[PDB]
Every structure is written in structure tokens, then in C-alpha cells.
Amino acid sequence: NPADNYHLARRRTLQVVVSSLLTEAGFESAEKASVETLTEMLQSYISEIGRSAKSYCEHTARTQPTLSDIVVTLVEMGFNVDTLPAYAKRSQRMVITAPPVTNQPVTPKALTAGQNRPHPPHIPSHFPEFPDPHTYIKTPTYREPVSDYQVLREKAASQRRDVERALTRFMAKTGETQSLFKDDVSTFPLIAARPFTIPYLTALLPSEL
Amino acid sequence: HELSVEQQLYYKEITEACVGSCEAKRAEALQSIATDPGLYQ
Amino acid sequence: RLKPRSIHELSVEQQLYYKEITEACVGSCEAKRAEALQSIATDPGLYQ
Amino acid sequence: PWYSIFPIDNEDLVYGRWEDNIIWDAQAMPRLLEPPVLTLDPNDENLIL
């Protein structure tokens, strides 16, 4: 979680500092509540020279503090500043490392490059570009229509020929049949010629009218 | 849209062959339905 | 009565996107593949 | 693709609830059914009109 790592990268650096300052001419294996006590007094001490040396310089109409604003800030906290050049030149002096950076890759993204659409004149050019079509563009689409007279004539012709062939083979198979050649019921079956009673009625009369 | 008389007659014969007058006409009607190429429409 | 001519559930920008992504993902060029693979890996509207 | 390359599926099968026509109990049938008119869908090819 990088949210609490904004605070815990610098407070757990102050925990290594107190653990390095309680080892210099001193302890090993301290109590746990005694370390979070002392690193709370350390954070509250840096934050108090921050607020008071800024207050002493801004009282003198300035914005960034000089040396004369901190040697009056440390006097008002009771520090006895003169003992500090001797403390800085210890042989036990140690350096605690700064915390690591979350964005170690820095630039690891190939990205997704998509451009479509422009800007209406109430949006200047420095605003981000309008995104791609899939985000908000919808058009219905239909099936490919075959309006060709050649293939429509071919389709109607072949369907009529196939249905009349199927009809005549079904009627020749389920009735009396004739055959020009011998053993010819499978190939070219003829519906047998059936006598009626009044042949002129089935000859001369129209059936579609 | 309306069936032509050819396929209207084919529909009539095929449906009335599967109502139960005899079994042989039913078997030939089902072998027609299963094995014809143009029965769409 | 004829039922209305239906439309495909993809847009033509979406259908063109599908055609470009599939013709890039058959790997004729490697940079084309890699973007198309990242596009598959993070397009939010790649459902449907 | 001024014409969709992908196949178009039956909107009724893909979307409609054909499960309201399943007759689970003949006597106690929940929805009163009605005669259906022929609709001759023109999306299907192989139909002249």
C-alpha cells in the first residue's frame, strides 16, 4: 500500500535513527514502547524547529531562515548550541540511509495508442483528445442483401426444378409405375397412365383461374 | 410468401402421410423429409 | 408481415477494431502484435 | 466492412424467451397462448422475398 507508505517511509527512517543513536555508547535490545516513544520525541523536535524558525524569520519579514534564526530558535528550546560542533565530530557518528522509491521502473508502460475524433470549438486544443470509437460510437449493421437478377433467376429456377423432381419421384414411388428401360424404378420412374371416366374434363378445363 | 401449388401439394401429402393411415407411406414420407435437398420455404 | 432487418450487436468501429486486432495478433509484425496484445490486456470494453 | 463480416444470428433465438412457450402442464398452463401469424423473416437468404 503506497498510501501509508507516504508516512511510514519517513517515520521508520526515524526508527533506524533512534536505533542507531541508542547503540552509540549505549544499548542493545531496547523495549518496543521505548523506541516508539523516542522516535515520537524526535519527529516532534524536527517539527518544532520547523514551525519556530519559520516564525522567527517571518517575524523579521523574511521567507527562508538563516543561521541567526535557528540559533535563536534553539536557544528558546534550551539547547546550548555551542556543544554541537563537538557532537558532530564523533568517531561513533553513523549515517542512516534514506528510504527507497516506490516507482523503481519509472517508465515501464508500453501504453495503448488510439486516436479518433477532433474537438468542437468550445474545447481548446490543450484539453485531452476525444477517445476512440468503441468507447461511445454505435451504428446498427445489417446482413448482406443479394439483389442480383442472375442469381435470383438461378435460385428460383433450381428450387422449382428440385421441388418438381422431388414431387414426381415421390408420386412415382408410391403408386403404379412404368419404366422405358428394364429394372428402372430408381432412375427415371414414370407415373403410370391411369384411365379416368370423362377425359375432356381433365384435358380442356383450366386449373388456375 | 404463399406456397406455390407444387409445394402446397407436397406439404399436404407429407403431413397427411404422417397422421396414421398406414405405416409404409409414413416411412416413405419420413425418408422424404430426411433426404430431400430443397425443403426450405 | 416481415420482421425488421436486424443489426449486429457490434458497431462498425468495434468490428473494424476486432478485424485489426485479429490481423495484428497473427504476428506479421512484432510491434503490431505487442500493441494488440496490450490492447487485449487492458481494453475495458472488450466484453460483448 | 460497410457490411458486417461476422454472421448475424436469429434475434429471437439469441434474445427472445422461447421458454414461455414450453408447455410444462397442459391443464395448469400459466400463460394463455395465442395463434401465431406467419412472419416471413427477410433476413434469411434462400427466401425469394
Side-chain angles (χ1 to χ4, degrees), chain B residues 7-25:
Chain B
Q7 42 202 19
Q8 218 161 350
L9 181 58
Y10 182 70
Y11 179 72
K12 183 193 89 72
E13 296 291 322
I14 284 298
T15 50
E16 298 169 353
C18 298
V19 300
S21 77
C22 68
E23 168 65 34
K25 287 179 66 180

Side-chain angles (χ1 to χ4, degrees), chain A residues 158-172:
Chain A
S158 68
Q159 286 199 2
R160 180 193 51 84
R161 295 290 303 278
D162 288 330
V163 69
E164 87 185 31
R165 178 202 167 84
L167 176 58
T168 53
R169 295 220 161 217
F170 169 67
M171 206 81 58

Side-chain angles (χ1 to χ4, degrees), chain A residues 3 10 15 17 20 50 58-60 65 85 89 135 137 141 158 174 182 189 193 202:
Chain A
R10 284 99 164 191
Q15 270 196 19
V17 160
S20 296
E58 285 183 350
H59 184 68
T60 65
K89 310 186 300 183
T135 61
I137 286 309
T141 230
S158 68
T174 69
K182 331 282 133 260
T202 186

